[PDB]
Design a protein around this ligand. Structure first.
Ligand code: BCL
Ligand code: BCL
Ligand code: BCL
Ligand code: BCL
Ligand code: BCL
Ligand code: BCL
Ligand code: BCL
Ligand SMILES: CC[C@H]1c2cc3[nH]c4c(c3C)C(=O)[C@H](C(=O)OC)c4c3nc(cc4[nH]c(cc(n2)[C@@H]1C)c(C(C)=O)c4C)[C@@H](C)[C@@H]3CCC(=O)OC/C=C(\C)CCC[C@H](C)CCC[C@H](C)CCCC(C)C
Ligand SMILES: CC[C@H]1c2cc3[nH]c4c(c3C)C(=O)[C@H](C(=O)OC)c4c3nc(cc4[nH]c(cc(n2)[C@@H]1C)c(C(C)=O)c4C)[C@@H](C)[C@@H]3CCC(=O)OC/C=C(\C)CCC[C@H](C)CCC[C@H](C)CCCC(C)C
Ligand SMILES: COC(C)(C)C/C=C/C(C)=C/C=C/C(C)=C/C=C/C(C)=C\C=C\C=C(C)\C=C\C=C(/C)CC/C=C(\C)CCC=C(C)C
Ligand SMILES: [Fe+2]
Lengths: 281, 48, 250, 304, 57, 42, 42, 42, 42, 48, 42, 48, 42, 42, 48
């Protein structure tokens, strides 16, 4: 199936060196060179919810668990359901993260829409990596990792997330939250910055980008335009992750101690050194 | 070139060729089986 | 209320919100049409809605949307696979019939209007707002195409007000017959420009803007689409292009 | 001094122009704000104007005495020196009337005093800035959706220290005031209620903040990506469908398996909006008058 | 000078590979470097290159 | 338009009746009395 | 204009008779009084 | 004019006797006092 | 001539009757001193 | 050769010596030959 | 009429009954009574 | 240039030399290779 | 007719069966009680 | 060339044997009851 | 450039020059690289 204007856009290529051997449009979906790759990755991956459903216990993805290896086995493998079989799921996950963000280029080079999209999933490629590769290779073994589940890695983040006291004292974490609540801060007015002009209240003539400049300059004193808030969505939604992968690339591997004990490096200053002031005083 | 006004199709006489080939007979015997493969199953296994 | 109540006014009132939302994103584009002009396979589980009335910003008519969807504009792809699926290929050269990577559309002859009573995009010789009167000022320098050779000379800027922005970079030919080219692809460093899209002997194939000051919304389709035409094919196959089109960083 | 024309953006500044005129006002908006022309070749560069009427400065004032009330309870312990203030600009604290006081405002300045003023004024700052986004879309001819994602946003503000701490009846049931005091409070509503993981109303509100970046990681990408063509102008791409609904409307259907209308890409983006602090306001109006310990909720309505 | 078919040559001594190739194309490969393939190389590659004589006891 | 035909029955309808069948089974296969599969011995 | 019924009864009110059906069924099963046709056990 | 008519005074007259009706029925059923559809044993 | 009239009368008429009653209902609905529907027998 | 209108393609005999000659391979090797796998099934083992 | 095959019947429709078949060969192996080849040791 | 009739492309004579030598040979070079290899698969190890 | 012969008839069977055989092995390896190397570990 | 020799099997089969090499290195080098080089301490 | 026949391509006799050295001896010496290894891994030490 294809759209009405999807007539002129149909042209073979996009893929690199080898030919148009893999680029057949199966339905509404694109099966380029990384299309059948993800077909190979998505077919094996549904079984990885069902494998440790006979080794760890339950058959329902409520408590299904293929645990990460232990902490100290070294630079190597593991048991199985408790690491070994866990060690196989990732290169599919990530091998499928990759075969997706780069099958887009077989459409990007196919037409001529920009290459800033093999990229906004690469802050998701550099956000799931920081929990599977970036951490547990150095402190001992692959045992420093989370479980894949949907209720297993839940009681892994809270009642097992106060190893560093409270994680709010974690400054970049809290800056990578000074970056996150600001994502829907600028989707809430921009997802409503194109809605109510052809549908004003009912009947009225449509607005142009000069009413935008009498509504938002009549809002919050800053009107960078309409191309300043798509440079104000891709500024809300990619970086709360490098300020979290930096809230953790120096947390646990260097600071497996209380980050509530980090906020006593601030009160130590020669000026007010030997001085208890307020609350502290 | 595509087509004209509402609806086409349509259309008279083009409403009964493909909305009636696997959309009418592919549902009536599906309903017959909802009667046939159900009435023989209207007795087992409610009664022990 | 209770411990088991409120999660049900939700598994229902919102279990059809991917349903109600999808159709509202499936206005334009749909219905689905085949590879010729034909009531196609179908639409989907979220079929297209029958549109509501659309009032336009500068009295451009009763253009309901989804609107015109048929085969008005010329298309030229020689159907390789008559079966629906396998792609199609242009007749002669793909940058003359306008098929593949270079796209456009035929619209009405009324350009984009703002609210002052005037058009949207004008050159610097159509708005004496900001000028040149201090030091030495760069609005007039030579360029280079993707063939790695000089292409022309750009000496002007199409100004903007509401966005205070820019949209085109006008090229003074040897003659004067107008040409155009987009804005974001560009990659200028020092004293000469480099574009990596079109070769320097395929710039005249870019339509002369009917007016050197006006861009009608009809014209603003190929004019920012021919460069996309050269982002797919270019360029088979051997030597310099391999050290030009591939690699790079930005 | 001249404004230059550098290499590859590009830009041109703006003389003396504002916006539109209908139901707004004339002799209220102040002088043409001075322009920040400092490498303003990327986005825009234009300060002013601003609707400085009594529908906006009621929040400048009511926010300011929300800003000064916890302020005169952030210098109170320092030692009356400017050394300890910026030293503990966060270590300082202030809590509302105690977990045993509640419905009476008879509390003096000390134990729990300067909580009763900050919010009282803020009450007509937030609520007088719900309607600086709801009626300035009426000064022209637009809609009201801009503060209907805001009525949903002040739905989470409709439970924290408002509707629950009065029915139940106490001010400790509202949020302490500071910069860390409430961070030692976001984990309070966690553990006292037996952890809110099996509370999929607080957790789906989460689940509606994990769809703000599944919805703006790519919007900020593709609208910047189909902009060489003409997809930056979001005010001429819907009813007169340009080629930006062709490089961005064939791009995603092939990929993930569906695309969207130039108008409908603002219909999901405000549906992962009026549902974040809205499913938060319910999932925090369902926490305190339903089942406190949510571990004793999510095993009787969850596994049992 | 030209084959007409495309925009390069077969062989010929002068003119061809004369002052192209190593002149213009991969000029970014080094300018971008000195900071990426030199800056990420001060406490990682040296982290594992001294181990050779010392940990041997 | 509105409702076409010759694509739904091939890849969608075969998994519509099946989808209408699946959310029915795992309750009547697991009711306090019915089941009719596992129990055949005693 | 501004509304439909070729989509408001062909597949909207036509699912207004199946979606509005099994909703109270498993809830009137949740209310311990009905059942009303379980003779297998008793 | 005013607001939508062939759009808003019909298809939204449902949630008047739906979303409103449902979350008021839900409470008056689950109350220890009502039930009404639970009284039979006497 | 500064704000609106037509909008307030069909939609903003609600924040006067409904969202002023439906929230004040459940207050006097939960009060024992009135009950009406919780009268039954107490 | 390109087409224009309903309902090509289509069409014939690109539909007659093609579409008739491949679809029954998916509607027999799995329709009645799938009841030949029912052999070692219908008796093994619904009855214990 | 319409519809497509030469593309679909080679790499598309094969994963429809494959979406129907192998998705339920697993299940007849989970049950501790059917199995048909699982319970062998005991 | 593209042609007309049944069916292209292609390519007579290639209904029994292309769509039967690398198409119907698959119904043999593995379909029967299964039947022989299963004599060393079917009994390992469903019987313990 | 159509489809492919010099393109997609020797590759719609290579990684296709690898997408249906070698990843089907992982089901008969999701066992550790059978298994052709995990029989001893029981 | 029917199959592609310097494409599908010169750097795409060298990782096709690399496909079935190291994924099993995390099963057979794994296993909770084998090792035979790691436990040189217990 | 391409022919029409079978394999063509092919490409006789490069179907037997580029599919003889790296294909035939490819799955032959890999049957001597992967299989001869089996004989020292069957039992050391799967037998535990
Ligand atoms: C003790 C409780 C602590 C705390 C416990 C933790 C723990 C533990 C962690 C964090 C982490 C983070 N916390 Mg914290 N955190 C707290 C509460 C919060 C609050 C809040 C307002 O309550 C916020 C806003 C945050 C925000 C943050 C960020 C700084 C950081 C998130 C990184 C991340 O997710 O990127 C990663 C991005 C991704 C994983 C997306 C990748 C996308 C991939 C490529 C695609 C997947 C496809 C998928 C498999 C398919 C599914 C789709 C299906 C097809 C349908 N935390 C409190 C203070 N928080 C994480 C962190 O800092 O490390 C980086 C972390 O581990
Ligand atoms: C034990 C740890 C628990 C947990 C503990 C809690 C607790 C406790 C709570 C949350 C709550 C939430 N959690 Mg949690 N949470 C967990 C995991 C997470 C993770 C994650 C790790 O992925 C994240 C990112 C979050 C973050 C979130 C949010 C989704 C949600 C509250 C939204 C919010 O902050 O709105 C806040 C926004 C507002 C209140 C509106 C603000 C707007 C105001 C009204 C405007 C003011 C006007 C003013 C005048 C403006 C002045 C501006 C000037 C001009 C400068 N949680 C784990 C499972 N979480 C909160 C909740 O409500 O649950 C649903 C809550 O209480
Ligand atoms: C970062 C700190 C914690 C953590 C903090 C939280 C918090 C807080 C939440 C989640 C929630 C979820 N987490 Mg988590 N999560 C972690 C690790 C991950 C990782 C990873 C591998 O790095 C990923 C990809 C995810 C993403 C996910 C989803 C599975 C789930 C819902 C996401 C959502 O609604 O937002 C947008 C994402 C989507 C819309 C994608 C859909 C994701 C779905 C649910 C996963 C698909 C799996 C599917 C069932 C398998 C199908 C396969 C076959 C078809 C059978 N988390 C770590 C351990 N995560 C939310 C939840 O509760 O789930 C309901 C939630 O509130
Ligand atoms: C005596 C009870 C019979 C039976 C009574 C019925 C009735 C009645 C119907 C089916 C129907 C079906 N049965 Mg039966 N069915 C049984 C239990 C099962 C079991 C099982 C878990 O043991 C399975 C896998 C099936 C399989 C199926 C489906 C193939 C089919 C549903 C059509 C569809 O896909 O939409 N039945 C037992 C063996 N089944 C439907 C059908 O398609 O008609 C045959 C249907 O109306
Ligand atoms: C077990 C029998 C139950 C019952 C369970 C159901 C179920 C299930 C449904 C109906 C449906 C109907 N029931 Mg009843 N219904 C009962 C008794 C009532 C009583 C009453 C007690 O006076 C009322 C006001 C109703 C309400 C109604 C109607 C609104 C509707 C039938 C016509 C229609 O489709 O619209 N039911 C008894 C107590 N009712 C149908 C409906 O509401 O769909 C629109 C439907 O699916
Ligand atoms: C259970 C009945 C309750 C009650 C609960 C409500 C609710 C709910 C509403 C009213 C409403 C009304 N009530 Mg009363 N009202 C009661 C007793 C009073 C008393 C008094 C005690 O003297 C006063 C001054 C009022 C005030 C009023 C009127 C202003 C109004 C009816 C006409 C109108 O719509 O304007 N109520 C009794 C005690 N009242 C309506 C209203 O004010 O909004 C339109 C409304 O929705
Ligand atoms: C012990 C054997 C089980 C059984 C378990 C399986 C498994 C496993 C499969 C089938 C499959 C089939 N079964 Mg059976 N099936 C049984 C009895 C039934 C009954 C019935 C109760 O009358 C129905 C309607 C069905 C349905 C069907 C067909 C749809 C299908 C075989 C034809 C085909 O290839 O497509 N089965 C008995 C109860 N059935 C196959 C299938 O669904 O693929 C399409 C398949 O893999
Ligand atoms: C800062 C980066 C942010 C981001 C951006 C982003 N995500 C993106 C994209 C972008 C630009 C896409 O273009 C792509 C998309 O399709 O749009 C939604 C996507 C996407 N984000 C997704 C999910 C997702 N993104 C998340 C986060 C983020 N995405 C970040 C917030 C999260 C959360 C909440 O952490 C989730 C759950 C997918 C819907 C989609 C990725 C599509 C894709 O690449 O598919 C490939 C996968 C397969 C082929 C399946 C094979 C995998 C195996 C078979 C099993 C995998 C095992 C694994 C453990 C899965 C378990 C999932 C959960 C249980 C954890
Ligand atoms: C759907 C949920 C998302 C959301 C939605 C949302 N937020 C919104 C809105 C919406 C619809 C708005 O309409 C409103 C807005 O206008 O956005 C810019 C807003 C807003 N959300 C904001 C923040 C915010 N967003 C948040 C998050 C979210 N909001 C979610 C992502 C949060 C969280 C996580 O809690 C916060 C705190 C603000 C940017 C804005 C609220 C505007 C407002 O109410 O401010 C009124 C103005 C004042 C109080 C002015 C007083 C200034 C100071 C208080 C005084 C001190 C300075 C002063 C200058 C002293 C100097 C003296 C001078 C006189 C010289
Ligand atoms: C140099 O310093 C000067 C002199 C300038 C003064 C500085 C002052 C400072 C330090 C200001 C700091 C302000 C900051 C950073 C405040 C931070 C606040 C934070 C992080 C969160 C606050 C959230 C808001 C909350 C918890 C408010 C909750 C209140 C409600 C939800 C409703 C309250 C309603 C009440 C009390 C009822 C009143 C209404 C009626 C009708 C009685
Ligand atoms: Fe937008």
């Amino acid at each position: 199936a294809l759209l009405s204007f999807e007539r002129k856009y149909r042209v073979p290529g996009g893929t690199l060196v080898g030919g148009n051997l893999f680029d057949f449009w199966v339905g509404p979906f694109y099966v380029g060179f990384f299309g059948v790759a993800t077909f190979f990755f998505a077919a094996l991956g549904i079984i990885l919810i069902a494998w440790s459903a006979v080794l760890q216990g339950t058959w329902n993805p409520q408590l299904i668990s293929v645990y990460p290896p232990a902490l100290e086995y070294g630079l190597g493998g593991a048991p199985l359901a408790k690491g070994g079989l866990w060690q196989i799921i990732t290169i599919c996950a990530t091998g499928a993260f990759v075969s997706w963000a780069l099958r887009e280029v077989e459409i990007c080079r196919k037409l001529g829409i920009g290459y800033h999209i093999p990229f906004a999933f690469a802050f998701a490629i550099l956000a799931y990596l920081t929990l599977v590769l970036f951490r547990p290779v150095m402190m001992g073994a692959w045992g420093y990792a989370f479980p894949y589940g949907i209720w297993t890695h839940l009681d892994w983040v809270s009642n097992t997330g106060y190893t560093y006291g409270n994680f709010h004292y974690n400054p970049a974490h809290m800056i990578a939250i000074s970056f996150f609540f600001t994502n829907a801060l600028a989707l809430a007015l921009h997802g409503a910055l194109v809605l109510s002009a052809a549908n004003p209240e009912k009947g009225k003539e449509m607005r142009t980008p000069d009413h935008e400049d009498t509504f938002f300059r009549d809002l919050v004193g800053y009107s960078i335009g309409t191309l300043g808030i798509h440079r104000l969505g891709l500024l809300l939604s990619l970086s709360a992750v490098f300020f979290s992968a930096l809230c953790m690339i120096i947390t646990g591997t260097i600071w497996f101690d209380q980050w509530v004990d980090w906020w006593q490096w601030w009160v130590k200053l020669p000026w007010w050194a030997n001085i208890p002031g307020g609350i502290n005083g | 070139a595509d087509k004209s006004d509402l609806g086409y199709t349509g259309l008279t006489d083009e409403q009964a060729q493909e909305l009636h080939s696997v959309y009418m007979s592919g549902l009536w015997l599906f309903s017959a089986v909802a009667i046939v493969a159900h009435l023989a199953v209207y007795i087992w296994r409610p009664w022990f | 209320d209770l411990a088991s109540l409120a999660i049900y006014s939700f598994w229902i009132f919102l279990a059809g919100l991917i349903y109600y939302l999808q159709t509202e994103n499936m206005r334009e584009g749909y219905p689905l049409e085949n590879e010729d002009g034909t009531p196609a396979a179908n639409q989907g589980p979220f079929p297209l809605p029958k549109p509501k009335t659309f009032i336009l910003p500068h009295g451009r008519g009763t253009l309901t949307v989804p609107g015109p969807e048929s085969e008005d504009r010329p298309i030229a792809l020689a159907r390789t696979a008559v079966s629906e699926g396998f792609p199609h290929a242009p007749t002669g050269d793909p940058m003359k019939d306008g098929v593949g990577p270079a796209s456009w559309v035929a619209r009405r002859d009324l350009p984009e209007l703002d609210g002052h009573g005037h058009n949207k995009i004008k050159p610097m010789k159509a708005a004496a707002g900001f000028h040149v009167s201090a030091g030495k000022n760069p609005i007039g320098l030579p360029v280079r195409g993707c063939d790695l050779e000089i292409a022309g000379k750009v000496v002007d800027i199409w100004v903007d007000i509401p966005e205070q922005m820019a949209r085109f970079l006008e090229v003074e030919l040897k003659d004067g017959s107008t040409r155009l080219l987009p804005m974001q692809m560009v990659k200028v460093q020092s004293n000469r420009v480099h574009v990596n899209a079109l070769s320097s002997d395929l710039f005249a194939g870019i339509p002369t803007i009917k007016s050197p000051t006006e861009v009608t919304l009809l014209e603003e389709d190929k004019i920012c689409g021919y460069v996309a035409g050269g982002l797919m094919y270019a360029a088979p196959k051997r030597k310099s292009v391999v050290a030009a089109m591939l690699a790079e960083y930005a | 001094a001249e404004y230059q024309n550098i290499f590859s953006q590009v830009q041109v500044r703006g003389p003396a122009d504002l916006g539109m005129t209908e139901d707004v006002n004339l002799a209220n908006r102040s002088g043409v704000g001075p322009f920040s022309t400092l490498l303003g070749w990327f986005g825009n560069a234009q300060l002013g104007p601003i609707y400085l009427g009594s529908l906006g400065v009621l929040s400048l004032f009511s926010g300011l005495m929300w800003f000064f009330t916890i302020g005169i309870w952030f210098w109170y312990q320092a030692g009356w020196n400017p050394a300890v203030f910026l030293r503990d600009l966060f270590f300082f604290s202030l809590e509302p009337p105690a977990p045993e006081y509640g419905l009476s405002f008879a509390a003096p300045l000390k134990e729990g005093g300067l909580w009763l003023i900050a919010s009282f004024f803020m009450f007509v700052a937030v609520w007088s800035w719900w309607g600086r986004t709801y009626l300035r879309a009426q000064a022209l001819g637009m809609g009201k959706h801009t503060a209907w994602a805001f009525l949903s946003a002040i739905w989470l503000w409709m439970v924290l220290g408002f509707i629950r701490p009065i029915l139940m009846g106490s001010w400790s049931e509202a949020v302490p005031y500071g910069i860390f005091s409430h961070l030692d409070w976001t984990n309070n509503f966690s553990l006292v209620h037996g952890n809110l993981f099996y509370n999929p109303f607080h957790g789906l509100s989460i689940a509606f903040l994990y769809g703000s970046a599944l919805l703006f990681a790519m919007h900020g990408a593709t609208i910047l990506a189909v902009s060489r063509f003409g997809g930056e102008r979001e005010l001429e791409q819907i009813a007169d469908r340009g080629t930006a609904a062709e490089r961005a409307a064939l791009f995603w259907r092939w990929t993930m398996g569906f695309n969207a209308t130039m108008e409908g890409i603002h219909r999901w983006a405000i549906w992962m909006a009026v549902l974040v602090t809205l499913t938060g306001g319910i999932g925090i109006l369902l926490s305190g008058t339903v089942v406190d310990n949510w571990y004793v909720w999510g095993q009787n309505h969850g596994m049992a | 000078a030209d084959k007409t078919i495309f925009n390069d040559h077969l062989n010929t001594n002068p003119k061809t590979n004369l002052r192209l190739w190593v002149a213009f194309q991969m000029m970014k490969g080094a300018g971008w470097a000195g900071g990426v393939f030199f800056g990420t190389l001060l406490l990682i590659g040296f982290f594992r290159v001294v181990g050779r004589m010392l940990p041997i006891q | 338009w509105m409702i076409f035909d010759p694509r739904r029955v091939f890849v969608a309808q075969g998994v519509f009746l099946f989808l209408l069948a699946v959310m029915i089974h795992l309750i009547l296969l697991s009711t306090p009395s019915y089941n009719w599969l596992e129990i055949s011995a005693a």
